[PDB]
Structures are given as structure tokens and as C-alpha cells.
């Protein structure tokens, strides 16, 4: 059934699994028309499909052309996500196909289940975890490939860079969720913390800066402080 705090270690076992987050698939700017009505303009989106064990990110870029002439886009966006995830699974060799797909939003269960009827042994699961994968578009290199896309495109990343050389998946996922949680709560402050020291750079083939183990501890503390400061504001506590 549902993925929660009780079954958290399950993410890092040797059963292939993917998280699917559909929150950046259908993105719009709301604006005034000449006549003073309101209209939306779609911008490029993405499906965030992540192996939490390996860090392998299957970023499917959703080009605005997929919405042209379509109705009920927020509903279509769930079905297009499920279509693209099903296509990705069918494109993988059998030994690479996930045994489970965890959707971050319960509205993705039926669309994905219907698209995956051909795969009755792939469990489709919700999660009680509140995962900050919406903040993926705060990672500069992911935002850049989405916004520049002129056509539908799949781009493969490792969202953990080379961290798994030094740390376990459990710790790599904890770091990633803390970074994304910070970026989601206060983007400007989070990015300031990540780039304030110009001597630490992002390798061309990486998403995040090349922090030493000690520098990651400092960064991780700065991100926790950011999240607590912001929380003490939101709530007046």
C-alpha cells in the first residue's frame, strides 16, 4: 500500500523503484487579456521520475505543443504523465524495469494504473511522505534544459552527482530532500547558501556544488536553519 515513515528504508533496498512527480508537468502564467479577462499561457514542463537508490533521474520535458487544442489540461496532464511513464518503462530492458512506482500525488494512481495494465506485477503506490520534488525546477541546470526545449525530449541526470562514492543512498536522498525542501521554502536564500563561496563550483557534469564532506555538513546545517527560520515566520511560532 502507501509509502510512509514506517517503511522508509524500503526506498534503498535492491528492488528497482521510481518516484513519479507530476507537479511541474502542466505549468502556466496567469495574465490579463486586452479586454481585462484572465487567460493562461503554458510554459514548458517536465515529469520528475527518480530512482531514489541510484539517483538516476528520467526528466521527460513536456513541450507546450502537447497542450495545443486540448481541453481540461490539468486532467490531461495526469494522463500524459502516466502515458510517458508507461512509455519509459516499456523502453527499459526487463531487468531495469521498476517493481514499484510511487506517485507523489494520489490523483496519479488511476491514470498510471490504467496505462500500466500490461504490467500487472508493477505495484503502483501512493506515499504519505510530503516530498519537495515540485522544487526540481529550482535546480538551475534542470530549469535550463526544460525552458530551452523546442520539442519533447527525455534528459537523463544523476540528481546525487557523485555523492554515492562517499555516502549511502539513504543519506543521499536525505540530503536531496533537505536541499529541495529549502529551495521550496525560500528559493533565494537556499541558492545564496549553495553559491555564496565562489571557490566551490558545480562541475560541468554535475547539478550541485563540489562540497567536501565537512562543507556538506555546514551546507546541510544552513539549510535546516533556513527551513526553521521560514517556519517561525509562516506560523508566528
Amino acid at each position: 500500500g502507501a509509502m510512509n515513515s514506517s517503511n522508509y528504508a524500503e526506498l534503498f533496498n535492491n528492488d528497482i523503484k521510481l518516484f513519479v512527480d507530476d507537479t511541474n508537468v502542466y505549468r502556466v502564467t496567469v495574465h490579463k487579456t486586452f479586454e481585462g479577462n484572465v487567460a493562461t499561457k503554458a510554459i514548458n514542463g517536465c515529469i520528475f521520475t527518480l530512482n531514489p537508490k541510484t539517483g538516476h533521474l528520467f526528466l521527460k520535458i513536456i513541450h507546450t505543443s502537447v497542450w495545443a487544442g486540448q481541453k481540461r489540461l490539468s486532467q490531461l496532464a495526469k494522463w500524459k504523465t502516466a502515458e510517458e511513464v508507461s512509455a519509459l518503462v516499456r523502453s527499459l530492458p526487463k531487468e531495469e524495469q521498476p517493481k514499484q512506482i510511487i506517485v507523489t500525488r494520489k490523483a496519479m494512481l488511476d491514470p498510471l494504473e490504467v496505462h500500466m495494465l500490461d504490467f500487472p506485477n508493477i505495484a503502483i503506490r501512493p506515499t504519505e511522505l510530503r516530498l519537495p520534488f515540485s522544487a526540481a525546477m529550482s535546480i538551475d541546470k534542470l530549469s535550463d534544459v526544460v525552458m530551452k526545449a523546442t520539442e519533447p525530449q527525455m534528459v537523463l541526470f544523476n540528481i546525487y552527482d557523485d555523492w554515492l562514492d562517499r555516502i549511502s543512498s539513504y543519506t543521499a536522498f536525505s540530503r536531496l530532500t533537505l536541499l529541495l525542501r529549502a529551495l521550496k521554502t525560500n528559493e533565494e536564500s537556499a541558492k545564496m547558501i549553495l553559491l555564496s563561496d565562489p571557490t566551490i563550483t558545480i562541475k560541468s557534469y554535475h547539478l550541485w556544488p563540489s562540497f567536501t564532506d565537512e562543507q556538506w555538513i555546514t551546507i546541510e546545517s544552513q539549510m535546516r536553519d533556513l527551513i526553521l527560520t521560514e517556519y517561525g515566520r509562516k506560523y508566528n511560532v
Binding site: 486532467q75 494522463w79 502516466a82 488511476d110 491514470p111 490504467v114 495494465l117
Partner: protein, 300 residues
């Protein structure tokens, strides 16, 4: 007007005949039911006064043979049997009638209720859902499971209703996932009506039989089947106009007949709210919506 004689009534029992019911006392001189209208299926059903567990009964049609009830003290139930000797049977019935030991099927002349509940129900279709081919009548009870309930366990004692599953390869064409899931018209019209039922009459017959098993036996799988067949029509954007008008009449008589006190276990809130208020056919069931709103406004 045909007759179902009883050899005896050795145990106290509530006897149902269609929508009617009578209490019989232990060893009461009860010898059966006469004046049963020809032209319809009937159901004769039982609930023992000493174990209200297992409502059970028999679907039959008096045009197909001479049927009687005899209590079996070994299996502890009232059994239907066919009498193959016409002259023996006629002589049994005449004696019991002459001695006025039979209840009369108590039909009011004005009252089309049973016709309206069984309009599309045919014994030959009942005998394919309830498989016991050596009898012309069909035994059903409270506890019998459906072929669908068994997939998710004795196959011989199952209700073989048509399997309806909205998240199945049968319901969803490759490449029309969203279309087929949100608009079940493909599944209703090509797979179920053209493919399996052949016509709307067989589909309605199964729907009506499932409702009556739900109501008369509290058969849970039957109730599931009745709701699934309603939901498949209400969730289709494209339904022939005659099917919608007939469905409204069917459901109206089912809701009218349902005991007020069983609405809580026999009606699925989600299906009915969806069918009357959200579905494509939300505005196509005027009669049903009016009787549901006036009789069961709590459920909605």
C-alpha cells in the same frame, strides 16, 4: 395460474414469493402457493425462524415444469423438486386446493410491480448465471459468491455474473486509456452490449436479476454486480436513448420496492451520488432521481 405445492412445513419459516412474504409455524398445515401468475419468472424464498442466517430460495418458471417444495431434515432446508408425473401432481394440487391449505399469490389487479422488476429476466439466462443444469429451477442464497469475488472459492456454487472491471484490459483499448477510462462507451457498447450480452435486453435481465438477489437474499456480490451495471451505463457519454429511458424505469421500480430499512446496506452512496449528480447521464434518470431524492435523501 400455476401452483407450487409443499409436502409439509415441519420447521417454522418465513416464506417469500416474489415481493410477498408469509410466516408459517412449525408443523402448520401449509401445502403451498396457488394462483401464481404465468408469464414471469418467480422466486420462492425462505428464512428459518430459528436461524435467520442463510436466506435461500429458488428461481423458477411454472411454464417449464411442475415444481414442489419438500423439507429435507438431513440438509435442513426446504428444497425445490420437479414432479415428472403430471397426473400425480394435478391430483396433489386439486386435494390441497379443495382442503384450502394453500396461500393465494396476493396480486392486486392494478399492480405491475413484479412485471416491472422482472421485465427482462428470463429463466434461460438465470440458469447460465446459476449453473445446475439437471434442474429447471435455480437455487440462490445469502452466502453464494460471484465469479468476480472468487478471482480476488467452490466454482459449482458461484454466481457467474458477467465480470465488469473498469481497470481491466477488457475495459481499456491500448492508446485510448484516458478516453476509455473517463467515457466507458466503448466498454458498454462494443465489449458488453455488442460483444457479450448481444442486446440491451440481456444486459437489463442480468442487472434486474442481480438487484433481486441483493434484495431477497442480501447477496453482497449481487449488489456489487447491480451497482457495476448501473455505473457502466451512467459513466458512458454515448448510450442509446431507449436504453436510458428503460434504465430510468427499471431503477425507479427497484428503488420503489427496496425496504426503506435496508437502504443503508443495499445502496452504494458513491455509485448513486456519481450516477445522479456527476455522470454523463446525471440528467437522464428523471424518475429515479425523483424517487431517490424523496425516499433516500440521507444517502445523497
Amino acid at each position: 395460474m400455476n401452483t407450487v405445492p409443499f409436502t409439509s412445513a415441519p420447521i417454522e419459516v418465513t416464506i417469500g414469493i416474489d415481493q410477498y412474504s408469509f410466516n408459517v409455524k412449525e408443523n402448520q398445515p401449509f401445502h403451498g402457493i396457488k394462483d401464481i401468475p404465468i408469464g414471469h419468472v418467480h422466486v420462492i424464498h425462505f428464512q428459518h425462524a430459528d436461524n435467520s442466517s442463510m436466506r435461500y430460495g429458488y428461481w423458477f418458471d411454472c411454464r417449464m415444469g411442475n415444481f414442489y417444495i419438500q423439507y429435507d431434515p438431513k440438509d435442513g432446508l426446504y428444497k425445490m423438486m420437479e414432479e415428472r408425473d403430471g397426473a400425480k401432481f394435478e391430483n396433489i394440487v386439486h386435494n390441497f386446493k379443495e382442503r384450502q391449505m394453500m396461500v393465494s399469490y396476493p396480486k392486486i389487479d392494478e399492480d405491475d410491480t413484479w412485471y416491472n422488476l422482472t421485465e427482462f429476466v428470463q429463466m434461460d439466462k438465470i440458469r447460465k448465471i446459476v449453473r445446475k443444469d439437471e434442474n429447471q429451477f435455480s437455487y440462490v442464497d445469502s452466502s453464494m459468491t460471484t465469479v468476480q469475488e472468487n478471482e480476488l472459492s467452490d466454482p459449482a456454487h458461484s454466481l457467474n455474473y458477467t465480470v465488469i472491471n473498469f481497470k481491466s484490459r477488457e475495459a481499456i483499448r491500448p492508446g485510448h486509456e484516458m478516453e476509455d477510462f473517463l467515457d466507458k462507451s466503448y466498454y458498454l457498447n462494443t465489449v458488453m452490449l455488442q460483444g457479450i450480452f448481444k442486446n440491451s435486453s440481456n444486459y437489463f435481465g442480468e442487472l434486474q436479476f442481480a438487484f433481486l438477489n441483493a434484495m431477497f437474499f442480501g447477496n453482497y456480490g449481487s449488489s456489487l454486480q447491480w451497482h457495476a451495471m448501473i455505473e457502466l451505463i451512467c459513466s458512458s457519454a454515448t448510450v442509446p436513448k431507449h436504453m436510458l429511458d428503460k434504465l430510468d424505469e427499471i431503477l425507479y421500480y427497484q428503488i420503489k420496492t427496496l425496504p426503506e430499512q435496508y437502504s443503508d446496506i443495499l445502496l452504494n452512496e458513491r455509485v448513486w451520488n456519481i450516477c445522479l449528480y456527476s455522470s454523463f447521464q446525471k440528467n437522464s434518470l428523471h424518475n429515479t432521481e425523483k424517487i431517490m431524492e424523496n425516499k433516500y435523501p440521507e444517502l445523497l
